[PDB]
Scaffold this active site. Structure first.
Site, PDB file in Angstrom:
ATOM      1  N   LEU A  56     -12.422 -24.788  67.679  1.00  0.00           N
ATOM      2  CA  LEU A  56     -11.672 -24.266  68.822  1.00  0.00           C
ATOM      3  C   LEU A  56     -12.468 -24.333  70.114  1.00  0.00           C
ATOM      4  O   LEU A  56     -11.774 -24.805  71.256  1.00  0.00           O
ATOM      5  CB  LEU A  56     -11.359 -22.817  68.863  1.00  0.00           C
ATOM      6  CG  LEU A  56     -10.656 -22.398  67.393  1.00  0.00           C
ATOM      7  CD1 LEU A  56     -10.515 -20.967  67.324  1.00  0.00           C
ATOM      8  CD2 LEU A  56      -9.162 -23.038  67.396  1.00  0.00           C
TER       9      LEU A  56
ATOM     10  N   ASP B 197     -15.021  -7.454  82.776  1.00  0.00           N
ATOM     11  CA  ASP B 197     -15.095  -9.058  82.761  1.00  0.00           C
ATOM     12  C   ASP B 197     -13.408  -9.537  82.448  1.00  0.00           C
ATOM     13  O   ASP B 197     -13.487 -10.564  81.453  1.00  0.00           O
ATOM     14  CB  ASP B 197     -16.025  -9.727  81.853  1.00  0.00           C
ATOM     15  CG  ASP B 197     -16.516 -10.945  82.139  1.00  0.00           C
ATOM     16  OD1 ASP B 197     -15.861 -11.683  83.361  1.00  0.00           O
ATOM     17  OD2 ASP B 197     -16.818 -11.758  81.276  1.00  0.00           O
TER      18      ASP B 197
ATOM     19  N   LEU C 246      -8.938 -14.873  83.357  1.00  0.00           N
ATOM     20  CA  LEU C 246      -7.936 -15.855  82.833  1.00  0.00           C
ATOM     21  C   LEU C 246      -8.214 -16.165  81.486  1.00  0.00           C
ATOM     22  O   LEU C 246      -7.496 -16.204  80.464  1.00  0.00           O
ATOM     23  CB  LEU C 246      -7.404 -16.884  83.546  1.00  0.00           C
ATOM     24  CG  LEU C 246      -7.008 -16.588  85.183  1.00  0.00           C
ATOM     25  CD1 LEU C 246      -6.588 -18.063  85.859  1.00  0.00           C
ATOM     26  CD2 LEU C 246      -5.681 -15.682  85.108  1.00  0.00           C
TER      27      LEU C 246
HETATM   28  C1  LIG Z   1     -12.893 -17.267  69.198  1.00  0.00           C
HETATM   29  C2  LIG Z   1     -13.253 -16.928  70.574  1.00  0.00           C
HETATM   30  C3  LIG Z   1     -12.133 -16.753  71.748  1.00  0.00           C
HETATM   31  C4  LIG Z   1     -11.581 -15.479  71.179  1.00  0.00           C
HETATM   32  O1  LIG Z   1     -12.131 -14.451  71.375  1.00  0.00           O
HETATM   33  N1  LIG Z   1     -10.326 -15.608  70.677  1.00  0.00           N
HETATM   34  C5  LIG Z   1      -9.659 -14.275  70.238  1.00  0.00           C
HETATM   35  C6  LIG Z   1      -9.507 -16.762  70.591  1.00  0.00           C
HETATM   36  C7  LIG Z   1      -8.339 -16.413  69.820  1.00  0.00           C
HETATM   37  N2  LIG Z   1      -7.539 -17.752  69.814  1.00  0.00           N
HETATM   38  C8  LIG Z   1      -8.134 -19.008  70.180  1.00  0.00           C
HETATM   39  N3  LIG Z   1      -7.235 -20.104  69.978  1.00  0.00           N
HETATM   40  C9  LIG Z   1      -7.482 -21.353  70.464  1.00  0.00           C
HETATM   41  C10 LIG Z   1      -8.560 -21.673  71.446  1.00  0.00           C
HETATM   42  C11 LIG Z   1      -8.539 -23.217  71.697  1.00  0.00           C
HETATM   43  C12 LIG Z   1      -7.667 -24.046  71.181  1.00  0.00           C
HETATM   44  C13 LIG Z   1      -7.980 -25.456  71.509  1.00  0.00           C
HETATM   45  O2  LIG Z   1      -6.912 -25.869  72.087  1.00  0.00           O
HETATM   46  N4  LIG Z   1      -8.899 -26.149  71.490  1.00  0.00           N
HETATM   47  C14 LIG Z   1      -9.301 -27.415  71.614  1.00  0.00           C
HETATM   48  C15 LIG Z   1     -10.313 -27.995  70.821  1.00  0.00           C
HETATM   49  C16 LIG Z   1     -10.570 -29.481  71.002  1.00  0.00           C
HETATM   50  N5  LIG Z   1     -11.072 -29.213  72.496  1.00  0.00           N
HETATM   51  C17 LIG Z   1     -11.581 -30.910  72.688  1.00  0.00           C
HETATM   52  C18 LIG Z   1     -10.002 -28.877  73.413  1.00  0.00           C
HETATM   53  C19 LIG Z   1      -9.820 -27.391  72.984  1.00  0.00           C
HETATM   54  C20 LIG Z   1      -6.776 -23.688  70.524  1.00  0.00           C
HETATM   55  C21 LIG Z   1      -6.560 -22.250  69.807  1.00  0.00           C
HETATM   56  O3  LIG Z   1      -5.528 -21.778  69.189  1.00  0.00           O
HETATM   57  C22 LIG Z   1      -5.300 -22.573  68.117  1.00  0.00           C
HETATM   58  N6  LIG Z   1      -9.270 -19.107  70.754  1.00  0.00           N
HETATM   59  C23 LIG Z   1      -9.946 -17.863  70.901  1.00  0.00           C
HETATM   60  N7  LIG Z   1     -11.248 -17.759  71.775  1.00  0.00           N
HETATM   61  C24 LIG Z   1     -11.432 -19.319  72.312  1.00  0.00           C
HETATM   62  C25 LIG Z   1     -12.054 -20.115  71.151  1.00  0.00           C
HETATM   63  C26 LIG Z   1     -12.687 -21.230  72.287  1.00  0.00           C
HETATM   64  C27 LIG Z   1     -12.874 -20.498  73.535  1.00  0.00           C
HETATM   65  C28 LIG Z   1     -12.640 -19.321  73.212  1.00  0.00           C
END
Ligand SMILES: CC[C@@H]1C(=O)N(C)c2cnc(Nc3ccc(C(=O)NC4CCN(C)CC4)cc3OC)nc2N1C1CCCC1
Ligand SMILES: CC[C@@H]1C(=O)N(C)c2cnc(Nc3ccc(C(=O)NC4CCN(C)CC4)cc3OC)nc2N1C1CCCC1
Lengths: 288, 296
Positions: free
Chosen positions: A21, A138, A141
């Site tokens: 992610l 904190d 977006l």
């Molecule tokens: C778990 C940490 C934090 C959090 O607290 N929650 C609750 C969270 C809940 N859901 C998500 N969902 C997604 C997050 C990113 C993506 C996505 O598109 N990732 C790509 C991966 C490849 N990269 C080159 C480009 C970005 C998809 C998601 O849904 C499937 N992220 C969360 N994050 C984020 C996790 C990355 C930063 C923080």
């Protein structure tokens, strides 16, 4: 190296690392699914080697302590945590449409009803926290996540604190908030009012498509926050611009409470969509 | 009684006392601005009644003599001095974010890049002094000042000395340094190496959030310095902990030179921020573990 399958000695439940992610600051985050249930969650995997400096161990412990005590439909679902010798594993609700940062980056300024749509849900989430004597400290977006149906879920309780007694003001922060409030900048002590300031900063960005105070260099950015220097474009609707001015005041006591905020003409007299279409992530929708 | 307006019989330039900054040891310090230029400086006003005991008159004279001969961007700007019958007035660069003592007191331990940020500037200031045959002999958080842009300026040359030839070792000190080096403690004679010891003590404090040797009572503190008794927490990064061990050695000759110090893996291989945000004085900043210079 990070294990392919994450095992919990406590509850004998085990997960399988999915797609990467991204890095949640100090963390390394993936999709994970339980071996038996096949239910998909968002794993947050912190190297324990980085949680060696106590100042960081303190933050981590408090983050999990505040977040595991919280259950609201506009707060990220905390579905448990565990650790091995090498890592700490934090299991959270997967929000399939990422965060408002991605929306903002694609769409820039939103329509006033879109702005209103998300903002009510944020305030509702935040009103629940405040009622449970929690300051997030904190809100940005990046940590206002969107589930499949574009419901806003407040996450990232890294800088969050628990108010112990009535009248308490806090000084120390285990990190630098995205939106620095004036009373944090001046190190004057702060309370719940910081969360209203960031919602004001967030509201501005959603309507204007740019942050209120942010500039090229940080020195000018912080001087503007100190003297309350910002300009609301002539194109913003009066009622909304008024509510921004109410929130973004140097005096914390002058700002609305999260409870007063929700009852603003912006929310009460303005049109709130019940649901947004998924096209709203890429193209501005028609209401009229 | 201290005059409201400070007059210089020599250069006919006159200043106006501003806000009280605090007592700089034996001194009484205020903001001052020149009557014509309106430029703001940091006044250091010493009662001449206290500069009556020769041992103290000697210190004062040498302080001004060494400091007025020095111009470097990591050394406090000396903008002149003068006296009347009652006081000696010393006009210095105003450092609007005070000293590392105030930072340390607020922040305790700093991040490793913050530690590195300030430490490079300190070493640079000190390398200039050493190059000009000057030993400071009393580097501490309190006299490492911060200008508006958080640039470190070395001040307070009270215990400073001028080396007359290369290899010369000194004995006598007209005051007690904050961080006592072993070869000062044992009265063995000392040189430039004392300044490296204090930077080692300063480095430790910035990273650990506590002094290396200091304890409740002084008797135990000095015994620890004599036997080189200190413990580096397991949480400190190896490279940094190594450089601390190199600096804080009983043998002066065993320690790095100020020139060798600056070229340590800590500095060369570690991430140095070009600028710190002003929030760093009150709240720890977040840095990427992958801070490349190939992205905004
Ligand atoms: C778990 C940490 C934090 C959090 O607290 N929650 C609750 C969270 C809940 N859901 C998500 N969902 C997604 C997050 C990113 C993506 C996505 O598109 N990732 C790509 C991966 C490849 N990269 C080159 C480009 C970005 C998809 C998601 O849904 C499937 N992220 C969360 N994050 C984020 C996790 C990355 C930063 C923080
Ligand atoms: C001249 C002595 C010495 C020195 O050598 N230099 C170069 C110096 C340069 N700049 C400063 N600057 C300031 C020092 C303190 C303050 C400050 O905030 N003072 C408060 C006053 C109210 N009080 C209740 C609490 C303390 C502000 C400063 O800049 C505006 N101080 C310097 N000092 C220090 C002066 C007293 C200790 C030593």
């Amino acid at each position: 190296e990070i294990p392919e399958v994450l095992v919990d000695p406590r509850s004998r439940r085990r997960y399988v690392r999915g797609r990467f992610l991204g890095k949640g600051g100090f963390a390394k985050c993936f999709e994970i699914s339980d071996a038996d249930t096949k239910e998909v969650f968002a794993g947050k995997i912190v190297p324990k080697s980085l949680l060696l400096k106590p100042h960081q161990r303190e933050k981590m412990s408090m983050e999990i302590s505040i977040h595991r005590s919280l259950a609201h439909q506009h707060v990220v679902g905390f579905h448990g945590f565990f650790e091995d010798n090498d890592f700490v594993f934090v299991v959270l609700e997967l929000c399939r449409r990422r965060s408002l940062l991605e929306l903002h980056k694609r769409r820039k300024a939103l329509t006033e009803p879109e702005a209103r749509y998300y903002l009510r849900q944020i305030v509702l989430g935040c009103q629940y926290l405040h009622r449970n004597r929690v300051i997030h400290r904190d809100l940005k977006l990046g940590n206002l996540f969107l589930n499949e149906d574009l419901e806003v879920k407040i996450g990232d309780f890294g800088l969050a604190t628990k108010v112990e007694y009535d009248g308490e003001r806090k000084k120390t922060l285990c990190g630098t908030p995205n939106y620095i409030a004036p009373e944090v900048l001046s190190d004057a002590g702060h309370s719940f009012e910081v969360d209203v300031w960031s919602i004001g900063c967030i509201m501005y960005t959603l309507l204007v498509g740019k942050p209120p105070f942010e500039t090229s260099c940080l020195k000018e950015t912080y001087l503007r926050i100190k003297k309350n220097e910002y300009s609301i474009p002539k194109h913003i609707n009066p009622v909304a611009a008024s509510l921004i001015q109410k929130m973004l005041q140097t005096d914390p006591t002058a700002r609305p409470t999260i409870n007063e905020l929700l009852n603003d003409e912006f929310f009460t007299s303005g049109y709130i969509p019940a649901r947004l279409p998924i096209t709203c992530l890429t193209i501005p929708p028609r209401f009229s």
